[PDB]
Structures are given as C-alpha cells and as structure tokens.
Amino acid sequence: EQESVKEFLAKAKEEFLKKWESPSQNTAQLDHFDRIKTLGTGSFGRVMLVKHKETGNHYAMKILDKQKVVKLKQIEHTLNEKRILQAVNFPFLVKLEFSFKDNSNLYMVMEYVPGGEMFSHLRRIGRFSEPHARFYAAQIVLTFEYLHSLDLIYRDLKPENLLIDQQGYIQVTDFGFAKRVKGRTWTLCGTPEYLAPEIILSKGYNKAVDWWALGVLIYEMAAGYPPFFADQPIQIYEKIVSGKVRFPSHFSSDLKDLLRNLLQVDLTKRFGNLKNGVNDIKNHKWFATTDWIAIYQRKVEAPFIPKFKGPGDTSNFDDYEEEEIRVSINEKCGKEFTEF
Ligand SMILES: [NH3+]C[C@H](O)c1ccc(O)c(O)c1
Numbered sequence: 001e002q003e004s005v006k007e008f009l010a011k012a013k014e015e016f017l018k019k020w021e022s023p024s025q026n027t028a029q030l031d032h033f034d035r036i037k038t039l040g041t042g043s044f045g046r047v048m049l050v051k052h053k054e055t056g057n058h059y060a061m062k063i064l065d066k067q068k069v070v071k072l073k074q075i076e077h078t079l080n081e082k083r084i085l086q087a088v089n090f091p092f093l094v095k096l097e098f099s100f101k102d103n104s105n106l107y108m109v110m111e112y113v114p115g116g117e118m119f120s121h122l123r124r125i126g127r128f129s130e131p132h133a134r135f136y137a138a139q140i141v142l143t144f145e146y147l148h149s150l151d152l153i154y155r156d157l158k159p160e161n162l163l164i165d166q167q168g169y170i171q172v173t174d175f176g177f178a179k180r181v182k183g184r185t186w187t188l189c190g191t192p193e194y195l196a197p198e199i200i201l202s203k204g205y206n207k208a209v210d211w212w213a214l215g216v217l218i219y220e221m222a223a224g225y226p227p228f229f230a231d232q233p234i235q236i237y238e239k240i241v242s243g244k245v246r247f248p249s250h251f252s253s254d255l256k257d258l259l260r261n262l263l264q265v266d267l268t269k270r271f272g273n274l275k276n277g278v279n280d281i282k283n284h285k286w287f288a289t290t291d292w293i294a295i296y297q298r299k300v301e302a303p304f305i306p307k308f309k310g311p312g313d314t315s316n317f318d319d320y321e322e323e324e325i326r327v328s329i330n331e332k333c334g335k336e337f338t339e340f
Contacts, residue, residue, distance in 0.1 A: 080175075080178055081178060115164035116164060117317075144278070212270065258285075
C-alpha cells in the first residue's frame with residue numbers, strides 16, 4: 001500500500017468519524033419541494049423526483065413510512081442508512097443533501113442522477129463487454145475500499161442500486177442495509193441472487209459478503225444474467241452454497257479466474273478478505289489495464305453516456321402509480337425515530 005493510499009484513507013476515516021459522531025438533522029422540510037414523479041417504490045418507502053422551489057435544483061427524495069418501517073423491522077436499518085449517508089463522501093456515492101422527518105415519514109433528499117439504473121441499460125444492451133464491465137467494477141472496488149476502511153458494510157450491491165451519471169460513471173444508491181460493523185454482523189438482508197453463502201447459512205459475517213456480491217455483479221454485467229438463478233429463492237440458495245458456477249465460453253480466462261476467487265464459498269479464502277485485502281483484486285490480471293487513480297479522478301472516458309435532455313429528465317426511469325405523500329395530523333412512532 002503506497003503511503004499515498006494510507007494517508008488518503010486515514011483522512012477519509014477522520015472526516016467520516018467527525019460527521020458520524022455529530023450527525024446532521026432536520027435540514028429542510030417537505031413544503032420546500034415540488035413533487036414531480038415516482039422513480040421507485042417498495043414495501044415501506046418510495047423514491048420521488050422533486051424540485052426545490054427556491055433554487056430550482058432537482059433531487060431524489062426517499063420517503064419512508066414510519067409505521068411500515070416499524071412493522072417490517074427496519075428501524076435500525078433506516079437509522080443506519082441516514083447516519084451513514086450524512087457522514088460519507090466519495091466520488092461514486094450519491095450524496096445526501098438534506099434530511100428531515102414529520103408526523104408520518106422519514107425523508108432523505110439525495111442527488112438525482114438522471115441517467116437511470118445500470119439495470120435498465122444492461123437489460124437494453126444484453127450484456128456489457130469486458131472493458132465496459134471492468135470500468136464499472138473498478139469504481140465499485142474503490143468504493144468498497146473506501147467503505148470497508150470506515151468499518152462499513154454495504155450489503156445491497158446489484159444493478160438496480162447503481163445509477164449512471166451524466167459522465168457515464170457509477171453512483172451507488174440504496175444504503176438501506178449499510179451498517180457500521182467492527183467484526184461480524186448477523187442480519188438476514190440483501191437480495192437473493194446476491195447473497196453470500198454465509199448469509200444464507202445464518203453465520204456471523206463480515207465485509208467478505210460485499211466482495212462475493214461484486215463477483216455476482218461482474219458475472220451479471222458480463223453475461224447478462226446472474227450466476228445463480230431459479231424460480232424460487234430456496235433453489236437459488238442451494239446453487240449459491242454448492243460451490244459450483246458455470247461460466248459462458250465468451251468470458252476471458254482472466255475474468256473466470258477473478259470470479260472463482262470472488263465467488264469463493266469459503267469466506268476465509270475469498271478475494272477481498274485475505275491478508276492483502278483489496279490489493280488481491282486491484283492487482284489481478286483482469287484489472288491490468290485499469291488506471292485506479294485515473295478512475296478515481298474521473299479522467300477515463302466512459303463506455304457510454306446515458307441519453308437525457310437535462311437534470312429533470314425522467315425518461316431513463318420507469319412508470320409507477322402516483323400516490324399521495326400524506327402526513328398525519330398526529331405524530332407516529334416518535335420515540336423510535338428520535339435520532340433521525
Ligand atoms: N434504486 C435507485 C433509487 O430508486 C434512486 C433513484 C434515483 C436517485 O437519484 C437515487 O438517489 C436513488
């Protein structure tokens with residue numbers, strides 16, 4: 001590790017810790033924004049495109065229903081998400097610009113990235129070439145190097161959680177499962193196709209699960225489909241734990257070798273979790289053409305630039321039923337979300 005990387009990560013940790021210890025709170029309110037379009041929706045929350053009425057800036061506003069968060073046992077996860085997001089700073093992480101709460105909801109107002117989810121682009125083109133997949137993978141490697149050095153585990157890597165920005169670079173979203181962890185953690189969370197074996201088997205697990213997920217992501221980017229798939233989760237899990245993966249013949253030998261080391265069932269042998277840490281990945285032959293510093297500095301020409309007309313264009317996102325943002329006249333779940 002060049003002292004330059006050590007000193008970068010030491011300063012990164014100092015800056016993170018200062019914000020972690022003293023989190024920002026209550027930095028805007030709902031009526032500062034106009035609602036434009038629902039960009040995504042789930043069992044306890046939504047992401048909305050909004051426009052700030054005074055500056056005209058567009059943002060992606062994540063709205064979480066406090067009662068549903070409680071019911072689906074997401075309290076600590078939502079507190080993790082906001083506390084981490086307000087404390088991190090890296091070129092490939094979506095920035096949290098404001099947060100606040102009201103009687104009914106929690107709000108995280110993030111940068112809006114108009115290029116859409118990697119998932120859409122991957123499905124439209126079919127599969128990415130190895131250089132294209134490598135460009136995105138390198139950004140994830142650097143982002144995980146950053147996060148893991150802060151004792152953070154991300155726990156939701158997948159194409160739907162990676163947005164393509166105006167320059168063609170990655171912006172990681174969706175910190176709902178991210179957690180500050182020294183050692184092990186135990187919660188069953190993630191997305192089935194991306195779960196490491198040790199999550200499936202209810203073990204105490206660590207940052208190695210993020211490196212496993214990177215193997216899944218790289219396979220999916222280069223093949224067009226993930227390595228372990230089936231009609232039901234239990235059948236996916238049987239495949240994940242088996243230690244067997246098949247590679248398309250069009251994969252390069254270097255790609256197959258990297259993937260066997262990321263998709264290593266034995267977490268004590270998995271790249272990213274050995275004595276040399278991230279450098280086993282950064283020094284692998286599949287990354288020989290990668291200029292890590294140039295990627296970090298965003299000096300590499302991207303494989304493609306999403307097509308969009310301006311900062312408010314939603315054409316790269318899909319259409320959802322537009323529901324109200326209702327705020328109760330009575331405070332709900334105040335105690336549970338005191339720190340938010
Ligand atoms: N999974 C992506 C998520 O819905 C989303 C969409 C647009 C954004 O700018 C964002 O920060 C998050």
